[PDB]
């Protein structure tokens, strides 16, 4: 028997001590080795309730990622609280590794095995575990990258559906790759991302239909972000240490939801040295990008959406890409987990 509680978690990883890659280095000092024989007990005839939007596991992961980035990605210039801090800014090796979050003695993690569980409500199917699955700390906006897929159906996630101020997480049940490349050889900050139109539009169509199920079969329309910082209006992520900003206009194409637009989709991108820190602490300036082919291939496994408020007589609903938290990224991976206290 068990009871709901919050406590300080620890982390585990398979980080290599000889590796200079910053996630490896951090985890070597801040985390323990993984368990090769992890226990998982299915809780027979037990129903447990979850709430991904009120889950202290999420807040704790954010702290770690903030801490990781702060000691690993020193900029040449940092603009924070009106102050400027300078230090050395060598190019680094950067590639996220899976991190498991685990409970200490007297506590355990409950896992919801409901395939179509939406992150809020009751879960009949529950298994206890010592540690979560390995979650890569991928920091991004609009699109969730290299993250777990829905087992069965596409799931729409939101703290409240009726409310428009609450971010919507679309959990994909099938990956779509992103290939971003800064070619070796003009403009060293010029880049692009290639996506498969046929595959993506098939998925996007399904997401539209899924959304229809939740909004009284109203018409679903995608539009580009109304405004804001470049970090949210564009697809923002970190690739091999370089901060990428990718235009997503082409990805949310209404007319393709079909003509011969089944070919490769190429998003225009730029690498920026001066950025707004996702930590919310201000602005940082980095050195210009390394030479040669900068390339990251990533699955698209989630989408962040904001719905337009004020629909009236018109039955349409408009959605725009971009989430309003980095915590939501971790939320999407931790939605099926919660900490409880053992009696």
């Amino acid at each position, epitope marked *: 028997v068990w009871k709901d509680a919050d406590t300080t978690l620890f982390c585990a990883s398979d980080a290599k001590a000889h590796e200079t890659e910053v996630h490896n280095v951090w985890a070597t000092h801040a985390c323990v080795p993984t368990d090769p024989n992890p226990q998982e007990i299915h809780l027979e005839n037990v129903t447990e309730n979850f709430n991904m939007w009120k889950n202290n596991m999420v807040e704790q992961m954010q702290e770690d990622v903030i801490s990781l980035w702060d000691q690993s990605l020193q900029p040449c210039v940092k603009l924070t609280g009106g102050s400027v801090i300078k230090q050395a800014c060598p190019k680094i090796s950067f590639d996220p590794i899976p991190i498991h979050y685990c409970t200490p003695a007297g506590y355990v993690i409950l896992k919801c095995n409901d395939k179509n569980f939406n992150g809020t409500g009751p879960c009949k199917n529950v298994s206890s575990v010592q540690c979560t699955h390995g979650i890569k700390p991928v920091v991004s906006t609009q699109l969730l990258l290299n993250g777990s897929l829905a087992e069965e159906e596409i799931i729409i996630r939101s703290e409240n559906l*009726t409310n428009n101020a609450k971010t919507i997480i679309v959990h994909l049940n099938k990956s779509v790759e992103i290939n971003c490349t800064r070619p070796s050889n003009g403009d060293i900050r010029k880049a692009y991302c290639e996506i498969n139109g046929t595959k993506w539009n098939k998925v996007l169509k399904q997401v539209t239909e899924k959304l229809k199920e939740h909004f009284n079969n109203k018409t679903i329309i995608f539009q580009p972000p109304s405004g804001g910082d470049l970090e949210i209006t564009m697809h923002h992520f970190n690739c091999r240490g370089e901060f990428f900003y990718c235009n997503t206009t082409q990805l949310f194409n209404n007319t393709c939801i079909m003509k011969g637009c089944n070919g490769t989709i190429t998003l225009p991108c730029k690498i920026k040295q001066i950025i707004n820190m996702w930590q*919310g602490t201000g602005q940082a300036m980095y050195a210009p990008p390394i030479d040669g082919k900068i390339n990251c291939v990533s699955n698209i496994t989630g989408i962040l959406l904001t719905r337009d408020g004020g629909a009236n007589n018109t039955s349409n609903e408009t959605f725009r890409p971009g989430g309003g938290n980095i915590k939501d990224n971790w939320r999407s991976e931790l939605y099926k987990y919660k900490v409880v206290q053992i009696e």
Partner: antibody
Amino acid sequence: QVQLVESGTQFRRPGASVRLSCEASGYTFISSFIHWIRQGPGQGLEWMGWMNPRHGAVNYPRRFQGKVTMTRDTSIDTAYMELRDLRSDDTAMYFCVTSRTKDYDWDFVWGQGTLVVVSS
Amino acid sequence: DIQMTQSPVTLSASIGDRVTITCRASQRIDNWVAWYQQKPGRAPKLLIYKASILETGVPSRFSGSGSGTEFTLSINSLQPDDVATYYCQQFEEFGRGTKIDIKR
């Protein structure tokens, strides 16, 4: 006390644009969404949109889309709403708005209002 | 997709009397609602939130209730200072407004 203090009443000529400011104090500017609402003379309240201070995220209703622009200044805790292509029917009282309650953006605290008069 | 309708459009009552304002929600499903007081040539003031919870600094005579479609704002004993326009609210939607008027 949570407080929003907006700029004084403005006078513009049709076709021109206006920029309205909202100075926040008494709370963490970053913590909650900022909304804008307009009141026609002898009329009800109309929601114009909301803005997120940390990343500048913006939401607009169908009617004000393309006609309204919301901007933020994090360093001075001041929010802005810019209205363009001003019309005679844009003459109204505009309010910058924020939420007193934690975790609930919708409950609101009202700024004293900024009257915008559009005349040639 | 939710619309708020207030009744009555105008409400005329004597001092010391109980006053009730009705707000109806089209969507049919809600648990949260706010009420506001607005005096002439003055900004609105939050009175009630979460349907039945009083804002700080608001007199005890003010109460809120209601479930589902219908919500009500009640004044236990009307005071001359309460004469103003009152609005209800659900998310981005407001009611048309009711003007409390001193009856003669």
